[PDB]
Design a protein around this motif. Structure first.
Motif, mmCIF file in Angstrom:
data_model
loop_
_atom_site.group_PDB
_atom_site.id
_atom_site.type_symbol
_atom_site.label_atom_id
_atom_site.label_comp_id
_atom_site.label_asym_id
_atom_site.label_seq_id
_atom_site.Cartn_x
_atom_site.Cartn_y
_atom_site.Cartn_z
ATOM 1 N N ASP A 1 38.947 48.236 49.703
ATOM 2 C CA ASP A 1 40.306 48.656 49.680
ATOM 3 C C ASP A 1 40.622 50.099 49.064
ATOM 4 O O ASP A 1 40.458 49.964 47.780
ATOM 5 C CB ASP A 1 41.426 47.810 49.323
ATOM 6 C CG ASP A 1 43.087 48.331 49.389
ATOM 7 O OD1 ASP A 1 43.249 49.572 49.637
ATOM 8 O OD2 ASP A 1 43.980 47.297 49.255
ATOM 9 N N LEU B 1 38.683 47.411 44.934
ATOM 10 C CA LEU B 1 40.390 48.126 45.384
ATOM 11 C C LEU B 1 39.854 49.600 44.279
ATOM 12 O O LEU B 1 39.625 49.452 43.012
ATOM 13 C CB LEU B 1 41.294 47.577 44.596
ATOM 14 C CG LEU B 1 42.580 48.383 44.432
ATOM 15 C CD1 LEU B 1 43.178 48.500 45.847
ATOM 16 C CD2 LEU B 1 43.420 47.570 43.694
ATOM 17 N N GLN C 1 41.820 53.359 43.898
ATOM 18 C CA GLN C 1 42.814 54.327 44.214
ATOM 19 C C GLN C 1 42.622 55.608 43.456
ATOM 20 O O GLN C 1 42.250 55.848 42.507
ATOM 21 C CB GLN C 1 44.270 53.775 43.509
ATOM 22 C CG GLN C 1 44.607 52.501 43.946
ATOM 23 C CD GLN C 1 45.916 51.888 43.435
ATOM 24 O OE1 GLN C 1 46.291 52.451 42.317
ATOM 25 N NE2 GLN C 1 46.402 50.977 43.716
#
Lengths: 137, 138, 136
Positions: free
Chosen positions: A27, A64, A66
Motif C-alpha cells: 500500500d 505501507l 506514504q
C-alpha cells in the motif's frame, strides 16, 4: 547544469503509482500535498525515491509506504514513511554510508541538489526518510 | 516540443495562488476572474515562472497583495502577475531578467522555451506588473 | 561513467527521432511505467537506434513498438517489429556481427551487466529483448 523544473509533488505521485505495480500488495501512496516545483535532475530525484521504497520493502519488510512533500520559502521537505522494522537511531550514519540496507544513493542525490537526507522514526512504525532540498527562488 | 502537454492556464494560476497563500502567511494572493484558456506547454516550468514572480514580489518587493490574471486572444495567452510592492525601476528591467533570484531569469527562460516573452510594466496596484505573453497552440 | 537514466523517456525520444528519419514507419513507445536505471545514456540510445535500424533496413519493418517492463530485478526493454525477422539459426551469432548485425546491442548489454536476446514477435518479425539490472 542539466537541471530543469521538476514538479516534485507529481514526481512522488507517479513514483507511488509505479511502485504499487512492482511490489504486490504494497500500500503506497502520495499523501495530499500542495504542488511544489524545484529545479533539479528528474531522473536522479526519482531514483532517490525508488531506492527509498525499495529499501523500505525489501529490507524493512514494509507493507505501507506514504510519500509526502511539505513546502516553504526555504524549499521542500520530501518524506518517505514506512511501517517496516525501521532503523535504530545509532545505525543511521552507517545506513547512509552503504549502497543497497543502504541508502547511499539517496544521500548522493540529496547532495547533488545542495540538500540533505536524514532518518527519523515514522508515526507508521518504521523509518521516516527525509530529503530537504533548496527551493529555486 | 514533444514534452509539451495541454495546460489549463487559468487552473494553473488558480492553484498557484492557493499554494502561495499557504507559503506566505501575510499575503493576499488571488486569480482575477478570467476565461478558461488551454495552451500547449510544460506545466512544471509555467508554474515555476509564476512561483518565481510571486517570490520576487514578496521577498524583494515587499508585496502584501498579488493578483494573477490571464487574457486570451487569437495570438495566445497573456499572463500577468501584478503586486503592490516597491516595483522595478524602468532602468533595471532587462538587468532583472538576466539575474537569478530581484532576479527573474527563470521567468524569462520559461517564456522563451514556450516561444513567447516576459516583460515588466507598472502595475495599477503600485508595484510591478510581470507579463508573460505565450503563443497559442492553435 | 554511469548516471541515472530514465529508460522510458529514452525510448520515447528514440521513437520520435526514428519516426522522422524513416519514411513510412509507424514507431512508438507502448504505455510503460517510468523506470530509472544507472547507465550510459549514449550507449543505451545507440543500442535502441541499432535495433530499430536493423528491423527497418534489413527486416523491412513498417511497424516497430518499443516497451519497458519494470520489476525488482531491473528493466526489460523490448523492440518488436513486423519485418521478416531473424532466422532461428542466426539468433545468437547476429549479436557477434556489426551492420543482420546487432553487435552494438550486445556490447551495451554487457557494459550494463545485462543480456540481449532475440525471440519471435507477435507482430510477425523480431522481438529484441534487452534486460538491464536495476540500481536498488
Amino acid at each position: 547544469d542539466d537541471h530543469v523544473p521538476v514538479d516534485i509533488t507529481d514526481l512522488l505521485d507517479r513514483a507511488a503509482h509505479d511502485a504499487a505495480r512492482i511490489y504486490p500488495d504494497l500500500d503506497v501512496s502520495l499523501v495530499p500535498s500542495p504542488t511544489c516545483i524545484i529545479v533539479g535532475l528528474p531522473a536522479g530525484l526519482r531514483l532517490a525515491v525508488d531506492n527509498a521504497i525499495a529499501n523500505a520493502v525489501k529490507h524493512g519488510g514494509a507493507t505501507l509506504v506514504q510519500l509526502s512533500a511539505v513546502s516553504s520559502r526555504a524549499g521542500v521537505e520530501i518524506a518517505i514513511d514506512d511501517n517496516g522494522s525501521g532503523v535504530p537511531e545509532g545505525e543511521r550514519q552507517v545506513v547512509f554510508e552503504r549502497f543497497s540496507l543502504g541508502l547511499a544513493l539517496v544521500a548522493q542525490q540529496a547532495q547533488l541538489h545542495g540538500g540533505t537526507a536524514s532518518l527519523e522514526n515514522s508515526p507508521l512504525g518504521g523509518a521516516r526518510l527525509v530529503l530537504r532540498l533548496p527551493g529555486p527562488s
